[PDB]
Design a protein around this ligand. Structure first.
Ligand SMILES: [Cl-]
Ligand SMILES: [Cl-]
Ligand SMILES: [Cl-]
Ligand SMILES: [Cl-]
Ligand code: NA
Ligand code: NA
Lengths: 105, 104, 105, 104
């Protein structure tokens, strides 16, 4: 949500429909990791994609776990309002416990 | 309630999502397809909104399976946090009531 | 979100616009408390309303803190899909720490 | 950057929210009113989307105050989690650039 954490949530960048293709999916994950790594070490990344037809929790969102709240906030500073795939990047934080239990919503 | 062959799904659709014919048809298909993972779907009812006319059960999805066993599997599989942006809540429905459209 | 907690979130029931009037606001709070109290002790309730023109976090949502996750889940069982003010009640949970810091989103 | 009389607000509006004329006008008013809590608003720019034509700064809100002091108050007041469903991120903008519409 709005309370700062070490997990960045990047919104508005992808639709469920575009994560179906494995090659395109892997490219998006790498692009995200590379871009975020500019702001600090990325511990982990989650980009939920459809599984067996199901729009799973967090589909359409990208979650990036940093090793500090500062690095997450620097990535928010740097990435918010940029454009990717002709869409404006929207940012918020993710509760770490919610991230680890994949309650992405 | 004891298990039956009819399952009611709540928090799965809002009325406003069922106004457009194409969107409604797409939802029926998607729900049928999801339920068919658990067993043969015999029928489905998703009551559609009509402004200013009472539509019992609008906001709910009722699915009829060919067996109580399959319906039990579907209650386990569909209830909870497996879908985006919702917590699915379920209940078994009396099949005779379902066929009469006595939806609560 | 989807992980069960002691805080129930009731959605789709009110718009920010209808919480402006103090009398109507107080009636909604009481109606909620009375209805939820059927399922267990209500420790606290939050119904964010506009403050000095600002659609504050959680406006349009109603948050009810119970003393157990069971009581919250019983209220979810009983209230989900009911109608209030001609609107279908939609339910989810709220992270307790998010509730206490008013990160209602 | 050092403080200036122009503030850029991010995560406050999406392009799709600015397509309708009435909705756009309502957003401009609401943003003006919110900013006016901190000082006199001299001007505001909310670049509007045009499909297939590049619109620099679309997705951002730029507000010009009559003083750097008021703008500093507005950065403190508007940045963070005070508004529903968003985390407002801000930055100071070069006033000359703002007047030229050199929006980044
Ligand atoms: Cl966009
Ligand atoms: Cl209608
Ligand atoms: Cl409704
Ligand atoms: Cl256009
Ligand atoms: Na109706
Ligand atoms: Na454009």
């Amino acid at each position: 949500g709005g309370h700062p954490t070490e997990v960045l949530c990047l919104m508005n960048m992808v639709l469920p429909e575009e994560l179906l293709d494995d090659e395109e999916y892997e490219e998006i994950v790498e692009d995200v990791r590379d871009e975020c790594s500019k702001y600090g070490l990325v511990k982990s990344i989650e980009i939920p994609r459809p599984v067996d037809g199901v729009e799973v929790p967090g589909c359409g969102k990208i979650f990036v776990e940093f090793t500090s709240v500062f690095d997450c906030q620097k990535a928010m500073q740097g990435l918010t309002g940029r454009k990717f795939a002709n869409r404006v990047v929207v940012t918020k934080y993710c509760d770490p416990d919610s991230y680890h239990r994949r309650d992405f919503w």
